[PDB]
Amino acid sequence: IHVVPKLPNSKALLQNGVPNILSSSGFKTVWFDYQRYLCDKLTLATAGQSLESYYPFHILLKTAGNPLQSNIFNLASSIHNNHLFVENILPSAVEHGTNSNAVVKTEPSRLFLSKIKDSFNGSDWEVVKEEMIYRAENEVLGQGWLFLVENNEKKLFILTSNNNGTPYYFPRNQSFDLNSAISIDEFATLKQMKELIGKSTKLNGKVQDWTMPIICVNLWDHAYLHDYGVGNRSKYVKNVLDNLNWSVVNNRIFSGI
Amino acid sequence: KSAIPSKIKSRYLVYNDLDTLERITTFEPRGGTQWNRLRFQEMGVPIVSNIGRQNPFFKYISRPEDESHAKLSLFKEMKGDTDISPAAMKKRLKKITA
Amino acid sequence: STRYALEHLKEGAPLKGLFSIEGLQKAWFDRVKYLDAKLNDCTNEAQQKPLETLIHENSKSASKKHIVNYASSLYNLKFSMSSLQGCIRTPPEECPRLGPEALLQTPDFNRTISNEPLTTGNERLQAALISSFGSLMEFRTLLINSNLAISGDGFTWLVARRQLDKRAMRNDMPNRDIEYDKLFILNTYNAGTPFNFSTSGVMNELNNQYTNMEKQRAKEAGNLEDSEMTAKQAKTKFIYETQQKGFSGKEVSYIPLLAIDASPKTWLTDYGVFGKREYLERVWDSIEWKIVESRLPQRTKIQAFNTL
Amino acid sequence: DEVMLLQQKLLYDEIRSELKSLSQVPEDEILPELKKSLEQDKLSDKEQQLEAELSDFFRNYALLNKLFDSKTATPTKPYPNLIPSANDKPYSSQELFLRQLNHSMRTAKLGATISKVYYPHKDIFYPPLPENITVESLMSAGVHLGQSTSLWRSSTQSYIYGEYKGIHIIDLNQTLSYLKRAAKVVEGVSESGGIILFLGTRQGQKRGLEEAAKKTHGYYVSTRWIPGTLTNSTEISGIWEKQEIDSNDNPTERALSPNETSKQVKPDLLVVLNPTENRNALLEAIKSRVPTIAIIDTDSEPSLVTYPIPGNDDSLRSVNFLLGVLARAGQRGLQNRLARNNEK
Amino acid sequence: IGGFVADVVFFQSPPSSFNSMGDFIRMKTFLFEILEASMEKNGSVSMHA
Amino acid sequence: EQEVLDVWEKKVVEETELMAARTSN
Amino acid sequence: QQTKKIDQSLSKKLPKGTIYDPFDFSMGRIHLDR
Ligand SMILES: [Mg+2]
């Protein structure tokens, strides 16, 4: 059985919702409704199979190669990405208890700022934010996810996923939409991706990758339609970008000690 | 009932008896019909119901329209025990006769 | 929005058992307003042209792809919402919201049927449907299953195959233009267009240009072609063409006849998430078959009703 | 500083290259030229003090260096040997592995949490307490399956609930009762401070035997039962060594007499997970008066063992389940004894 | 074809690869287009390629 | 199938050599 | 090329419609069915 994890301050999030980002009803829809739907779907899909004993992340990693296991792959990816998103937008990572943790707001770390500096030609974090929203609104034509990710080259970069993609595994990034017209350079990118796949030396048809997610934002209408409405996803993304759990973001960042 | 030996490195098998007089489990470290079915699904050519109408997976109200030489079908049903003509079908025929 | 209005729907009104006032607004009117705004914001000075003509004339170009995006989305929503008329069931605003038990609930498409065209008197459409999908139960189950399966914003269409006659694209041939062969069901995602005659071969042409440019690079670098360079590319090209080899003459095109929307924006407002099945069922009950029977083109009389 | 740390990790090797150089050339062509310059370099400048200091330096460093010395902390930082890479250059494989561990411990678990799923290691490490075992749990473990009808030992007719799929089905109710009694007796010996020996030779049982033995401070055998272990202890095991321990089960580091260490040391409770293949041990235990416990299948004599536990013995899950229950009973007993002698 | 033996038709000419490879033709892989798939009373699946 | 058919190939060539040799005798 | 004709003693003729597995092509199948 895959059950929805217990978020901290669940009573607060249920009574009033996450501040400045989502309403009580909207957060209900995005988590207490959609996550339950997704988890029950996954349980019914993987019941009576070896995959029932693995967490969604390992499920998506295992099922990435297999074509036919696209339902379980998509379900696991959506569950994991949704939890990542909600975790990074949590107001308080740890319950206040008898301590006044709310007295201080979270801020990005100097290591994160330096990482941005090197990664984006020494551009400001706000510049990267505006470029991120522009890319998100220009690329994802429908449902999808937005990621700021870190590769093995120690440099952050932006990744846009359509429907239910995974930053971790690159052939399933779902970055490109082939429904509409496509460009020569993009076709070449797909071709070199195919060649890199062909280079694989295992029957499983797997290629190593280490693209880890530092920041995740859900673009599914289940999150924004109720409050912001049609066509305002840009404002929704802007708001979530400005309001984040930088403790979680920094913890995701790799320290090296 | 038994613990399969160690050298079986495959996660699939088939079997008939849990235990036997020889203190072994009659099994075979096999199972590939799953792969045949998955390959067929990949081919993705649906099966057409030639001659036979009224796809079985669906309920219909056409059965009431049952007018086709029912005597032959009834003869078939009576002769259920098709194994031994002088004994099996004979005793089934005797039951039907009674 | 005036150029894309419809008699059935009105402003500040709910649909019969399908959409509330707010549901209809946020589903149709907000979407059409936003699409019109952005489409006119983009370079579409030839607005007087029909949407279908715009899509056909402008395509196969990343530089002019957002125009196709928005126009195709608008046309898709238009066609998908056109067929709806309303149903007998209770309005959603009064109908209780569904919960997790909806998933466990078992469908009854295998044992029931409703809203048959024969009731409205479209025996032509009924005969076509039976000859194509076997039975109305087959057809209904296929439609609902496919639409519930599609997750991202998309549509499910009842398409009719039209086999282009051997010609050099000579127009104005009345009484023989719109002739279909068989009925099929198709899925489209985001901005997909169910016509296929302005769509087939895009990747093949991209691959051809790519291999040609790679050949130029090899020649200018003084390289020699390899076994894979001469065999793998040839095999890929051959399979591509054979797969998109419907017929010798301009292949085969598809005439739309019906479309159903799967975008969550259409049904999450008044059905939550668990109610996608219920929304699809009510959509089925809310099809006016007169529109689809009107859109159904003639059958291929040539050789078929000729039987000679 | 950090520049000295990042100076390519191998610098000033030209000095080594030079000291390698000038050696291949013969001496006759170099040394005369260098030695014919001392007459010039002597000059007249004062040198006494400087040369005395230099000589003292040579004596102290070159001639007084200690090649071998002498007559004859907290590992706060992990991966001390680990070294960092350059900021501009990509991650190292080790750095990737550590980042992987960080992700696994923090973000990988995200998603959903699993429930009502079986994990084999939990049978060994988190066994239930005897009073909480259920017939459902035993059936899930598979204790109910027995040998085929064709191998049935009629002496076990009282433990059969029936036959299904061509094999006998043990009565889990009787299994549960006998298991409760066995758990109580093992716990009793645990408080008494006796010696509990768990014996299982079938493949894969070593993990369970070792865990049980360690958590009840007992002993285990998994390779083979040397015949005469108890009936011929003087010969089989006299060479090995014993300990003297206090009531708290702590070594006291007291020298032992040769005779004291050469006396026999006999188990107080013998649990056998494979009685069928371990007949010799049961006979030695009976003839040496050692109470024994066993898991009895439908083809094993129940009379050889004082406290039988009717159940399957050919499956690791069942044997692990039962052995873990017994081990936790022994553990609670040991805990009670430790508490009592720690605080009266 | 994918675990199933299928009845294969030829496009009016057997390839010269058949004459070249003889009885060892199983070594090489070819491309097939599945016209139809049907059933038989014995439970067998008869597919045409 | 390929990893089986290569072994089958080698086996068939060796055995056909053997049987041609025996037939020649 | 090389020898081009072989007998039926060691070449499995799969019936039409029958489901098969890769192992069927091995030399082992011939030994098993004999
Ligand atoms: Mg046994």
Side-chain angles (χ1 to χ4, degrees):
Chain A
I1 301 316
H2 305 267
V3 311
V4 178
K6 284 173 31 62
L7 294 186
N9 310 346
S10 179
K11 293 179 179 179
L13 287 315
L14 201 43
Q15 167 262 349
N16 59 20
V18 78
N20 329 296
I21 291 309
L22 259 284
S23 67
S24 60
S25 56
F27 188 77
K28 165 188 175 61
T29 304
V30 74
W31 190 244
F32 300 112
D33 187 80
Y34 184 50
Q35 195 72 354
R36 164 61 151 291
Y37 154 82
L38 255 192
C39 289
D40 70 57
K41 277 285 317 198
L42 177 60
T43 298
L44 282 174
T46 178
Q49 303 192 350
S50 60
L51 293 170
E52 143 183 337
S53 186
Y54 300 103
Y55 281 29
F57 176 73
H58 308 107
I59 292 177
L60 80 96
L61 262 58
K62 296 176 69 64
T63 62
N66 220 332
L68 275 291
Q69 293 183 356
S70 290
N71 317 343
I72 55 186
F73 177 79
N74 292 356
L75 279 292
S77 179
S78 62
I79 296 192
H80 183 73
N81 299 356
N82 211 342
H83 198 301
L84 250 170
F85 166 70
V86 86
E87 162 185 299
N88 71 55
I89 49 176
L90 291 202
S92 188
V94 181
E95 313 192 358
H96 304 294
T98 61
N99 305 355
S100 301
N101 307 348
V103 79
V104 54
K105 179 192 170 295
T106 66
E107 276 318 316
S109 151
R110 218 164 308 87
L111 162 54
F112 181 70
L113 273 307
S114 180
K115 286 273 299 153
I116 292 175
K117 293 179 179 179
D118 53 87
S119 301
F120 287 94
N121 302 343
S123 306
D124 289 345
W125 170 217
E126 293 177 350
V127 178
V128 171
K129 291 173 65 175
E130 52 76 20
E131 171 36 31
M132 194 146 33
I133 168 57
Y134 167 79
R135 173 141 161 210
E137 172 65 20
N138 187 26
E139 302 295 345
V140 154
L141 318 181
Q143 313 306 332
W145 302 78
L146 175 62
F147 302 99
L148 176 60
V149 314
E150 177 184 8
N151 72 354
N152 56 313
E153 302 216 349
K154 306 211 273 293
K155 51 145 293 181
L156 316 182
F157 84 111
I158 279 193
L159 183 36
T160 182
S161 317
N162 301 339
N163 289 331
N164 288 336
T166 84
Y168 298 96
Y169 204 69
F170 83 80
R172 307 299 295 266
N173 288 337
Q174 292 264 60
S175 155
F176 296 107
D177 172 8
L178 298 314
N179 292 272
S180 65
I182 208 69
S183 52
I184 279 284
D185 52 353
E186 192 275 9
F187 181 81
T189 305
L190 269 67
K191 179 60 62 65
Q192 63 82 12
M193 281 193 47
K194 201 159 305 300
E195 183 178 2
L196 194 40
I197 278 183
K199 183 178 179 180
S200 182
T201 63
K202 298 177 295 296
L203 297 182
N204 62 15
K206 301 281 213 52
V207 183
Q208 293 177 335
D209 193 6
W210 310 87
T211 44
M212 293 195 139
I214 301 303
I215 279 195
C216 171
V217 175
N218 185 2
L219 305 176
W220 276 79
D221 48 16
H222 302 87
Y224 81 80
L225 192 57
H226 187 71
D227 297 357
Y228 298 82
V230 180
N232 325 105
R233 164 161 81 191
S234 302
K235 305 179 169 58
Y236 149 81
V237 175
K238 174 60 180 298
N239 293 9
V240 52
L241 289 176
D242 184 1
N243 294 325
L244 260 177
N245 198 311
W246 292 101
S247 302
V248 174
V249 177
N250 297 348
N251 284 6
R252 303 226 190 88
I253 295 284
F254 177 68
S255 64
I257 180 58
Chain B
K1 162 53 157 42
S2 64
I4 298 301
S6 321
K7 86 161 163 42
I8 300 80
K9 71 183 71 81
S10 174
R11 296 194 305 97
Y12 306 88
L13 70 76
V14 292
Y15 80 114
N16 294 1
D17 315 350
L18 290 304
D19 281 345
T20 68
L21 184 57
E22 317 85 342
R23 294 181 131 100
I24 61 135
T25 294
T26 60
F27 79 97
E28 287 295 343
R30 294 201 330 190
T33 171
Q34 48 173 340
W35 312 136
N36 299 336
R37 171 179 48 83
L38 287 176
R39 298 174 220 280
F40 189 92
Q41 187 172 357
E42 281 185 8
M43 309 184 29
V45 179
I47 291 165
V48 55
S49 192
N50 288 334
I51 305 178
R53 316 288 72 172
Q54 269 48 45
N55 175 19
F57 298 136
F58 271 92
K59 175 187 311 306
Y60 309 102
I61 321 90
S62 181
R63 293 182 183 174
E65 313 154 356
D66 187 11
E67 305 85 18
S68 181
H69 300 291
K71 183 178 179 180
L72 183 56
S73 307
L74 266 60
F75 263 57
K76 171 49 190 181
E77 293 168 8
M78 293 177 182
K79 65 185 300 182
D81 276 20
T82 323
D83 299 13
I84 325 174
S85 45
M89 338 177 184
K90 179 173 294 177
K91 293 179 179 179
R92 278 287 290 272
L93 178 161
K94 285 302 178 280
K95 159 162 288 170
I96 297 303
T97 300
Chain C
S1 182
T2 62
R3 293 178 179 83
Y4 320 103
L6 153 63
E7 291 69 23
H8 320 339
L9 318 178
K10 296 298 182 184
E11 39 284 40
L15 191 52
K16 317 180 186 177
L18 259 291
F19 301 92
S20 68
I21 197 155
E22 175 183 358
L24 186 57
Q25 181 68 27
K26 302 186 65 175
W28 160 248
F29 293 105
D30 293 355
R31 273 189 83 138
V32 61
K33 198 166 69 204
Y34 187 93
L35 290 190
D36 296 350
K38 196 135 288 296
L39 179 52
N40 232 32
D41 183 20
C42 301
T43 312
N44 69 338
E45 293 72 20
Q47 183 155 46
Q48 60 277 9
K49 302 295 294 297
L51 291 153
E52 308 176 5
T53 295
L54 171 70
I55 297 295
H56 292 347
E57 68 92 5
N58 182 17
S59 61
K60 301 186 179 184
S61 59
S63 59
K64 302 180 62 178
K65 72 182 179 65
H66 38 66
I67 318 300
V68 182
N69 202 353
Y70 300 124
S72 301
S73 295
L74 184 53
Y75 186 68
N76 289 337
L77 177 62
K78 189 66 173 151
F79 216 65
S80 207
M81 158 284 285
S82 68
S83 302
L84 306 183
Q85 57 171 352
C87 87
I88 316 308
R89 293 183 183 174
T90 174
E93 38 277 22
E94 293 177 350
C95 205
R97 295 269 170 165
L98 293 187
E101 164 280 348
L103 286 308
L104 311 164
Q105 168 300 329
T106 302
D108 45 2
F109 318 137
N110 207 16
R111 298 171 285 100
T112 68
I113 184 60
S114 179
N115 195 14
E116 309 83 357
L118 222 50
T119 65
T120 66
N122 303 337
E123 67 294 340
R124 188 191 189 187
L125 177 66
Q126 283 277 180
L129 260 298
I130 295 301
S131 180
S132 53
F133 306 98
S135 78
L136 292 185
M137 286 188 178
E138 301 324 326
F139 169 77
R140 181 194 176 190
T141 303
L142 206 166
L143 265 301
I144 302 322
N145 275 19
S146 301
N147 221 27
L148 165 156
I150 167 164
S151 295
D153 300 289
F155 301 86
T156 326
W157 305 60
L158 196 149
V159 285
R161 181 142 65 68
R162 137 167 176 72
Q163 174 174 25
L164 292 312
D165 288 348
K166 300 185 63 180
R167 264 315 185 190
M169 183 176 282
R170 296 188 181 184
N171 293 356
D172 195 9
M173 294 300 293
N175 300 316
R176 182 171 171 176
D177 182 21
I178 48 173
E179 290 192 9
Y180 88 89
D181 181 19
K182 155 163 191 83
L183 270 288
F184 304 93
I185 288 284
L186 178 65
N187 276 322
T188 58
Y189 317 82
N190 293 16
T193 63
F195 300 109
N196 167 304
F197 66 84
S198 58
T199 325
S200 56
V202 174
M203 292 266 157
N204 195 15
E205 309 323 307
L206 267 290
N207 224 27
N208 293 344
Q209 301 300 342
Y210 177 93
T211 178
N212 297 345
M213 152 293 300
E214 288 292 354
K215 157 190 178 65
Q216 314 309 331
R217 306 323 301 288
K219 296 309 302 299
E220 60 95 359
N223 301 343
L224 289 309
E225 70 293 335
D226 299 340
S227 178
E228 293 177 350
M229 198 50 239
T230 59
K232 183 190 183 69
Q233 319 302 335
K235 170 161 37 181
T236 301
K237 186 175 182 299
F238 182 68
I239 78 161
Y240 267 68
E241 184 283 337
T242 314
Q243 295 224 61
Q244 302 299 337
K245 197 178 183 299
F247 181 55
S248 178
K250 309 301 209 294
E251 313 294 355
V252 292
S253 60
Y254 290 117
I255 280 63
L257 297 177
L258 158 74
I260 308 144
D261 190 355
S263 178
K265 314 183 180 69
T266 305
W267 46 266
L268 62 84
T269 300
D270 45 0
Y271 301 97
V273 304
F274 308 113
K276 189 182 185 184
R277 182 85 71 55
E278 275 208 329
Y279 152 78
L280 295 175
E281 173 51 30
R282 289 188 174 194
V283 162
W284 171 267
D285 259 352
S286 311
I287 305 156
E288 178 178 350
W289 304 108
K290 173 54 58 179
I291 302 177
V292 317
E293 82 91 26
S294 174
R295 293 163 173 173
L296 161 53
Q298 179 143 267
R299 196 177 300 178
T300 43
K301 258 74 177 189
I302 64 182
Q303 175 180 355
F305 282 105
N306 293 2
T307 67
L308 259 57
Chain D
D1 305 1
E2 185 177 1
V3 179
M4 171 185 168
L5 309 180
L6 302 177
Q7 63 180 13
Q8 187 178 2
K9 286 68 66 175
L10 296 174
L11 194 54
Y12 323 105
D13 292 348
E14 71 277 6
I15 304 171
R16 301 168 171 89
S17 76
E18 287 305 339
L19 67 83
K20 179 182 304 300
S21 182
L22 194 54
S23 303
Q24 41 76 26
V25 56
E27 164 273 342
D28 55 350
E29 300 125 10
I30 313 293
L31 179 56
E33 307 184 349
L34 277 52
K35 78 185 188 183
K36 290 182 302 181
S37 305
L38 283 306
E39 183 174 0
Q40 180 64 8
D41 77 6
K42 283 198 301 173
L43 190 54
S44 300
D45 298 357
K46 64 177 63 178
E47 296 292 351
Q48 180 69 8
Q49 178 183 2
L50 303 163
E51 68 178 0
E53 182 65 9
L54 289 170
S55 300
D56 191 7
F57 174 85
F58 299 116
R59 276 72 180 276
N60 199 15
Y61 286 78
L63 309 188
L64 265 49
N65 176 34
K66 306 310 178 188
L67 302 160
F68 161 77
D69 195 14
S70 183
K71 170 61 170 55
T72 183
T74 289
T76 297
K77 175 242 289 183
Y79 309 106
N81 189 0
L82 193 87
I83 73 194
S85 65
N87 297 345
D88 41 14
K89 302 309 298 177
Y91 281 116
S92 79
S93 301
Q94 297 91 322
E95 287 170 345
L96 291 170
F97 165 74
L98 300 174
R99 192 178 67 160
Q100 204 81 322
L101 261 54
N102 289 337
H103 173 267
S104 178
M105 294 300 293
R106 293 182 183 174
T107 307
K109 319 303 296 179
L110 303 187
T113 64
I114 308 303
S115 304
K116 309 177 180 258
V117 171
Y118 173 64
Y119 285 93
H121 64 275
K122 295 187 180 181
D123 298 359
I124 305 178
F125 287 103
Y126 302 119
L129 315 81
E131 68 279 0
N132 302 332
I133 282 62
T134 64
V135 52
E136 311 287 3
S137 68
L138 295 169
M139 178 167 158
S140 302
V143 175
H144 63 310
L145 306 172
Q147 308 285 348
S148 172
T149 58
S150 312
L151 306 71
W152 175 47
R153 183 180 290 267
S154 188
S155 67
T156 67
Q157 186 271 350
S158 180
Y159 302 140
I160 311 307
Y161 184 100
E163 63 185 342
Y164 189 56
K165 309 289 290 184
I167 63 175
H168 288 278
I169 310 299
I170 302 177
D171 187 314
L172 292 312
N173 306 348
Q174 307 185 292
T175 300
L176 177 58
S177 69
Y178 281 101
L179 178 159
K180 277 181 160 59
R181 167 160 48 253
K184 293 310 318 303
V185 53
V186 59
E187 146 173 345
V189 294
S190 178
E191 293 177 350
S192 75
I195 305 189
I196 301 87
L197 174 57
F198 304 92
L199 171 43
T201 285
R202 196 177 306 273
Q203 193 172 16
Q205 298 185 347
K206 180 177 181 297
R207 289 298 299 120
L209 291 167
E210 205 210 23
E211 295 314 314
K214 76 165 62 180
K215 74 167 53 183
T216 176
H217 294 197
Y219 302 84
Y220 85 99
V221 173
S222 65
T223 59
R224 153 181 169 110
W225 177 264
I226 308 314
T229 290
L230 305 182
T231 60
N232 199 8
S233 307
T234 52
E235 280 255 35
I236 301 301
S237 187
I239 65 179
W240 312 129
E241 65 296 334
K242 295 76 172 174
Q243 57 179 168
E244 152 60 51
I245 39 184
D246 68 350
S247 59
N248 178 263
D249 302 359
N250 301 335
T252 63
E253 300 88 20
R254 191 197 73 179
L256 304 178
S257 180
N259 54 2
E260 180 284 352
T261 185
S262 66
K263 293 188 182 182
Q264 163 181 80
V265 165
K266 190 165 54 182
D268 291 7
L269 201 172
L270 174 62
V271 177
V272 180
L273 295 307
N274 63 347
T276 59
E277 329 304 335
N278 190 212
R279 305 289 287 274
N280 298 338
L282 302 172
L283 273 40
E284 296 191 22
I286 294 169
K287 178 163 156 181
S288 53
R289 304 180 298 79
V290 173
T292 173
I293 302 174
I295 56 179
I296 292 309
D297 200 355
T298 68
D299 69 347
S300 155
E301 201 46 30
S303 69
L304 295 174
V305 55
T306 313
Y307 296 107
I309 303 180
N312 186 6
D313 59 354
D314 312 293
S315 287
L316 293 214
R317 187 178 185 180
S318 66
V319 300
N320 289 349
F321 199 87
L322 275 49
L323 173 44
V325 165
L326 275 278
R328 196 176 182 180
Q331 181 186 358
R332 180 166 73 207
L334 169 66
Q335 188 47 266
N336 298 359
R337 170 165 55 88
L338 293 181
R340 294 142 72 261
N341 55 347
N342 184 19
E343 181 179 0
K344 302 293 177 61
Chain E
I1 307 178
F4 300 87
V5 189
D7 69 80
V8 152
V9 304
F10 69 114
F11 177 80
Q12 295 294 161
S13 293
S16 298
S17 59
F18 290 18
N19 311 347
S20 180
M21 220 59 77
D23 304 355
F24 280 48
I25 188 66
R26 297 133 74 100
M27 274 326 84
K28 183 172 178 179
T29 180
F30 282 93
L31 281 308
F32 302 85
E33 156 38 68
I34 291 72
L35 277 293
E36 294 184 344
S38 181
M39 283 203 248
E40 271 286 20
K41 61 196 65 64
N42 65 352
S44 68
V45 165
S46 177
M47 53 164 36
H48 294 240
Chain F
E1 278 172 35
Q2 292 291 165
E3 316 143 70
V4 175
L5 288 169
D6 289 345
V7 178
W8 172 88
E9 180 76 332
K10 282 193 301 311
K11 284 322 162 173
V12 64
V13 315
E14 61 166 30
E15 78 82 25
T16 203
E17 281 315 82
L18 267 52
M19 292 178 72
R22 292 191 295 169
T23 303
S24 73
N25 193 321
Chain G
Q1 307 174 21
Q2 301 180 3
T3 302
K4 59 218 312 180
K5 185 71 60 55
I6 200 155
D7 53 17
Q8 324 66 61
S9 181
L10 68 181
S11 64
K12 170 65 182 297
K13 210 166 54 165
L14 258 44
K16 104 192 191 193
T18 36
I19 182 68
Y20 81 84
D21 283 21
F23 168 83
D24 76 342
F25 295 128
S26 295
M27 212 76 257
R29 155 65 64 201
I30 299 77
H31 306 131
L32 265 51
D33 36 32
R34 270 206 285 270

